């Protein structure tokens, strides 16, 4: 129901330690593989999320599926096509030729995805993906299990329209049905339905399309179908020109919330891309209204996290390919190593905001100097230095 | 609190089986009876609902009560009068005559209910019902326990203003109170209060009104009181003319959501009525954003449900009087038997939507042909058959 | 996550007993103390709240902190200053002389007895007692609030402080002073002072010569809107009454039609003042739990629940907290000194349903329903409707 | 544009007189007629409305059309079929047999006396009368609505029709038949039929053989939500009453707490039924103009405005329209045959303020204010507050 | 005030004719020029809009200004940098070296051909051309918008500038320099530079060796409301929302795409038609349409309230045309195709089709049209079904 809770330490988010995490299981398909982070880790259970890394080979088709939880998809590498189906919307990508005959077809709009895209999809919505590039298409999918859109319980379901094998709730939805019953409903013979059920077809859930996928797509140009049915699903965060915060020699923050992408308001999710130059820092801070789930796409650095105890919750490296969860209100500091550091972060609220302890937007600045003089037993000059020594907002220059 | 959960990889809604459910327990009153579905069934626990079927006889008055959860009430049979009390609104049903005398009275608006009506009531609202007719008035009540309006825990409370019993949380709220204390508050003798407590009453919670209930109701015509206090509480779904989908020879769907009945937006519920002619079907589909709770009011059919396992969750018949629950995102197929099939369904969201696997609105059409060719290993002809063979939306013609 | 439940059919709110509660644990600081109600009590876990009574001595400073749950704060006694920081807003209380009165900071709030202050989760707040009498704050944290995505336990995360299972901590302590120093651009020895290790004054510190801040003197863009949100309203003046019955008393309600921030927080409050022997009509809360604190006097409280047996029937008095869950019927009568209560309710626009008086459910139902249900005569059923002509506050005559 | 104003204090609503009005022009069609109230009357200009009475005879089809202003349609008499088209919604009334009963189209609505129907600007609608008695539609268009970005004049754009300054036109006529034919994929002589070349039936045509529609038979995605929006509600049954005073009569209110589309449209309505000699309490509309149509009976209406002299004190009777602007005080009493009124108000959640009865402003103000303002005794002031125990509808024998 | 009306049965939008329009006036600057469409034209007064085309030369800086009306800006050609200031937001583009490379300013936006930028009334904005080719901005100001509480005329208030009936002014000129200097803490000689009264470069100035900005390069509320996206690019055929092979595309821009459009009550689209392709005949059900032809040409027919066509003729590159709410229209591309950018005066503006799968013809029962138009049943089926496209028609 709407009223759920995780499987399970005075409480499920009273974590004494957090660690960067790697995937715990790999599923092979014909045309790629899926790596799953352990859904039972305390970090993931506290954050209410699942995390998956799909790796789709060249000419690989990821079988359409729907989930019980909304998600953000980060395109980590590659480029391709994503489909998303809005039920009751007309098919507006149309070709009435020929009369390669598979070019005669009508379907819903398809989306051209590329590295740096963050794609937002509701629960219940069918989606699929196809890699048209030579390099692998790598999708990092964060499913928000605790979202109001999931009325089941705090476990991910993946319901596929097709597929078969080459504790997970992952299934071809046509399999548990009577093919004759489904056949009569669809107006097709039950042997067509047996092909939907994928009997004797063990390619997994990403299949190779040998000669390339044929679809209706716009060529070079050298009612509600216009509004609701056209909702923007993604935005690219990769261009440094898309930065919202920029400190020269320090790096960028590129935020993605419902002031940018409208569907995020319904989904109650946000994201960001942070790029740090070598040795640069993000100001120490906490998330005031959200958990943060970060994936390191490039580089490395040091992360320190503080919680409820006098002892540190984590103090160590993060590096490429790792995920890390920072719960709401835990304090954290990041510094890039010598190669820089690039992260994408999903946050469990729309309009997720952080509170800084350093810089022009700091809580230290906002409090009277004499409060800090008394609390910290500082002199006036020591407390001024605390307020004003860093003049940056959010992104710290390693050279100050 | 707001943060609750039921009694129940594995999860409370990870169901490998569902079955049609009949009531598990009957409570007999003087002027009718109440049948309760087992609240501990896995289906009900997952969907976060209770279900009750109240049968109110001729000249039967169902004692006023309030609950901790909002509800939809389906009028399965009969007709009668329903009261619902909005606190802080004035009494706008008014008679100043005479000077028999109980006709001199003021009370809030009463509602004239009939078969096919679906009535929506928030948590905490006092309501009551009466049957004027000779046929029984049958109300199917679906309480949404996981609703935000319920801050207590995932169990139904029934708090009656009167009544007496001769674990269910069903109680006459006056009984625990000190009658002297309540009488001093109310300005009445503590013996009137002991009549409110009804400690020696054997009639239960539906009482006979031998000579018929008298109230202030409009006669033949042959400020905030106009707006908030007037909120509409019901809509009738029975007329085929109220259909939103109609397929000749197949049947109708009549949907009830917040574009139809404004109070549903606040309650986060919606409802529909499906009528299938013999052997007709509703397209195979799943609910995107809600659980479904269906009650068979006439006829019979076959239902198949799929879930997360390669094996079916249910494949069998459904029959008049049975309740069945389909959780969010489970796929289901329905076909009417040889007498047709009528269902009313409550869904656990505002503007609940289904996604079809067949027909013009199908997800199959929406996806490029070549994806299906590749995924299912179909020919181009077979893929096109799959897209276009059924030209219906939602309700399938058996011919 | 967003989907949680307390450590608590036998639901967490199926309470066969309630009773008025006093705090169970006290924490001593240099400049006052903190009294905590037992967070494990069935009543508190049902209501989804934590309750704290902070007592701040003269010249005492309550170290800044933030929590995982929104709160209402009732100023039971005294007066003082309250800070609340909105991240990303500029410092608009400014002094540029001399060139610690040279400072810029956020707007500070002047608080006094009768104020109800509303703060979201995650916001840094602090408080200072200006007056000679103790400043007494009753804080109700709403743990089950949507703003709390962690679990159903309060975190108090302090910016400073140290000792003079609770999740109460100086957030600087678990960070590396050299790492935090580099980010802050200060020496690590300054960071060690933030960590307060060697400083054991607790979380309320004495300010010998009085706190110096930027405050407005006598006058004898987004900074103007979002950043200037109202955070409190005073409920004490009988003139702020919304319901008044002469010889009876007042109810002074605080909801989002009064204080806008309450809409986002999903909380409201009220102050009830009853003259000796007066009553609030019997009723139930139709969309909220109520958490009441008795600030003055005493009275009788009866609560009814799901059983034939009363859930409570007895005295309430000064200093006690009582919880009435959603839908439970209750009646209150003031004793011979009167009765003052402040109450917090777990909803935006919390509403009660009356069983007595001009807004009663009894009036709204047809007379012949009550005739038949209760086996009353017509005169008796009219008595029941009409004998009390008051709304909400009953006149002891 | 959005920023408009009428052709014509003394501002446009500083009205020294209001009168009940009758229609000023009749347009004859083949299969009925349309009666139009004078759009230049000061009352209609003030209220920002256009009022039309359409009379559709048996087997009369009112040609589909759309307007630049939203409307409330009151079914004064008869019953029939109404269609409204939501663009981009699928056709969910479907018949696949035989292999003009084989058709798909959008939902059609079965309309009857007492129905109030709400339609936005720009939506195509049409109606058909299958019954013996004439189908009588009173259409109130809200010209000043935000939905109308043109100017303060109604347009009536028909998809068909031709004559049997009003802006009333068959929209196909100003198009080039070759160009339109190419676009539609039909021969340009089919297009000439669309232009209703040589067809002079007006805008209600007779259906010689009766209309063949796909309509639900007896039962003895977005298409389910947005595309299903409720367009109407019946107000006629005394059981639907929101306010009832025995021997006095009823008020049945229609606003966005009842019919959700009204929120978007910023309109509301009500039906008032008064037994002989009964009254509606004197009052004013605090946030809307009122546009009332008398469907049955007769009565006395008095209106007060900004001057010492009454704005109107006189009879109203069946078939008359009367406009009461925002904040003008009014009182109504039924005649010896009772009085039935349907009223449109220019706001979502239109409310009135009562000078008499339990909801009155008199009750809300301290007694001593009225003692001092009116120079009454304490007893006279209590009489004023309390002599009428009714809310809104007054008992002629209280 | 909020209650206004344009300068001058009969009504301001009862148009018997519409025409494609070109600018009526050209204002030269040092580093570009501005072309203004006649604001008294019946079409523009009906639609409640002004239209301007600014052409900015290489290394030209368009002086910052603010207006009383919200606008959509179409980047017709070129690329550059646009600034927009949100008052009360912090400067988050920051350089602290050397110790004018050392500066802090608000975010700057990299604009390019195909971008549609949305700006509220009252917001200071400015633009600079990075490239060799001219930067060409087509600006549609929505005068009738609720954001304009003044009256139905555009004001252009510049922070600088001076000449090289329009309400176009350097806001510092009417101020006393001593008084403004005292407030600003600067000498009155700086304020006289602000006033620019002996500067004859106009409102677009040449920046000799490039503008020095803090901008990214080799790779609280400040993160939310201060970040609001102001633009979306419509040029890529892949951004298309409606696509008919051999016909063209429609790429729509409304508040389900770009959140700020909800507050502004505006939307836009780009239409690209292959040679001889059509958009289905239709009307705008809830807005006026203001179309600018960026490429190519075509035939446009418009119908209104009479039996006489309102317009039937060609539209060509560089021309603006207005279709009021509810007027019916048909468009066909000429032999080079047609590209249009359109601004519509509503949030979530929608059109109704007379042809194709979404048509009103399909939604109405067959027998209604059989009776209205005196068609055979086969004719009326042809009328519903002969075009199976939605919105964009295949010329074959
Ligand atoms: O109306 C039609 O003929 C096509 C159409 C419009 N909206 C639709 C949604 C789903 C499937 C088809 C359609
Ligand atoms: O812009 C500035 O220079 C100051 C400023 C404006 N808004 C702010 C928000 C937080 C901190 C500083 C500022």
Author numbering:
A (entry chain B): 27 to 34, 40 to 130, 141 to 207, 219 to 274, 285 to 462
B (entry chain A): 27 to 34, 40 to 130, 141 to 207, 219 to 274, 285 to 461
C (entry chain C): 27 to 34, 40 to 130, 143 to 207, 219 to 274, 285 to 461
D (entry chain F): 27 to 34, 40 to 130, 143 to 207, 219 to 274, 285 to 462
E (entry chain D): 27 to 34, 40 to 130, 143 to 207, 219 to 273, 285 to 461
Please give sentences taken from the publication describing this entry.
The pro-globulin consists of an acidic and a basic subunit bridged by a disulphide bond. 11S globulins predominantly exist as hexamers due to the non-covalent interactions between the trimers. In this study, we report the crystal structure of 11S homo-hexameric globulin complexed with Indole-3-acetic acid (IAA), an auxin, isolated from seeds of Wrightia tinctoria at 1.7 Å resolution.
It belongs to P212121 space group and has six monomers in an asymmetric unit forming two trimers. An asymmetric unit consists of six monomers arranged in hexameric assembly. These six monomers of WTG can be divided into two trimers (chains ABC and DEF); that are stacked together through hydrophobic and hydrogen-bonding interactions. In one orientation, the amine group of the indole ring bonds with the backbone oxygen atom of Gly119 of chain E. The carboxyl side chain oxygen atom of auxin interacts with side chain NH2 and NE atoms of Arg427 of chain C and water molecules in the nearby vicinity. There was no density for any metal ion in all the three pockets. The results obtained from MALDI-MS and HRMS confirm the molecule associated with WTG is, indeed, indole −3 acetic acid.
